[PDB]
Amino acid sequence: AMRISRIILXFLFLRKK
Secondary structure (H helix, E strand, O other), rough: OOOOOOOOOOOOHHHHO
């Protein structure tokens, strides 16, 4: 499902959020 822009989200809830 175009998981290319959900790892930079999949990084967001991972940055500290």
